[PDB]
Design a protein around this ligand. Structure first.
Ligand SMILES: OC[C@H]1O[C@@H](O[C@H]2[C@H](O)[C@@H](O)[C@H](O[C@H]3[C@H](O)[C@@H](O)[C@H](O[C@H]4[C@H](O)[C@@H](O)[C@H](O)O[C@@H]4CO)O[C@@H]3CO)O[C@@H]2CO)[C@H](O)[C@@H](O)[C@@H]1O
Ligand SMILES: [Cu+2]
Length: 224
């Protein structure tokens, strides 16, 4: 359980953008059903909020996460797993992120040199999570997903046992990109509902074992 408080652009807090430029869900509840339409942008994913975060191709974006109160434990430390970041064109305001529209622009999972997960890193850095807007990205409005997966119950799956299974905590943010940018258009055209499966060994994952590495779900990060 956790969700996003606000977004920063090159070290600059844009200010609490919950229901302003973040499609904030009612609560910190997870997604578990792979079939669910909220897998993409969570349970108010399809409801537009009015403001966009104003950034540029190449800007360094920091998403701030919190559990109950801004600047608390961010997420129960049992919730160990990766942290992926995606991008899809803002096709129109009532898009809910479903369909074959997404491209992977960032990830972390399990670094075995340090035996630390992405979630370990996020707690340590106070719920701040950095990534970059590809330099060659084309101008105009996108949607930036970013999703924590907690694997403390992935030692079974939602379809076989529903009291457990992977837990998704996606947050979708509206972005208007300025500046010169480039030609590059995200064209990996990924679909959470089609593309995340219960047979995926990075979704049915026994984190309670002698394991050396973690297969991050979805495609590679996208080039240009
Ligand atoms: O399964 C084999 C493995 O189990 C290990 O223990 C696990 C449990 O399996 C797992 O169910 C448990 O999950 C907890 C979770 O850690 C808590 O953080 C969470 O709390 C939620 C709560 O649901 C909400 O009401 C509240 O608002 O939010 C908090 C989070 O912020 O509750 C779930 C269970 O409901 O995690 C255990 C790990 O500590 C054993 O340790 C291991 O030996 C076994 O091999
Ligand atoms: Cu939780």
């Amino acid at each position: 359980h956790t969700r996003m408080f606000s977004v920063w652009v090159n070290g600059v807090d844009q200010g609490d953008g919950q229901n302003v430029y973040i499609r904030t869900p009612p609560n910190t509840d997870p997604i578990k059903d792979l079939a669910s339409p909220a897998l993409a942008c969570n349970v108010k994913g399809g409801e537009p909020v009015p403001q966009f975060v104003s950034a540029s191709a190449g800007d360094k974006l920091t998403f701030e996460w919190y559990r109950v109160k801004r600047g608390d434990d961010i997420i129960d430390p049992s919730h160990s797993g990766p942290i992926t970041t995606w991008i899809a064109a803002f096709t129109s305001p009532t898009m809910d992120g479903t369909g074959p529209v997404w491209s992977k622009i960032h990830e972390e999972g399990y670094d075995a040199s340090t035996k630390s997960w992405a979630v370990d890193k996020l707690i340590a850095n106070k719920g701040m999570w950095d990534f970059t807007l590809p330099s060659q990205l084309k101008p105009g409005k996108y949607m930036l997903r970013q999703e924590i997966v907690a694997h403390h119950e992935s030692d079974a799956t939602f379809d076989k046992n529903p009291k457990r299974g992977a837990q998704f905590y996606p947050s979708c943010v509206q972005v208007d990109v300025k500046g010169v940018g480039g030609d590059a258009v995200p064209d990996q055209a990924f679909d959470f509902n089609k593309g995340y499966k219960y047979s995926d060994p990075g979704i049915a994952f026994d984190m309670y074992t002698d394991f050396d590495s973690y297969p991050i779900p979805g495609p590679p990060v996208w080039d240009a």
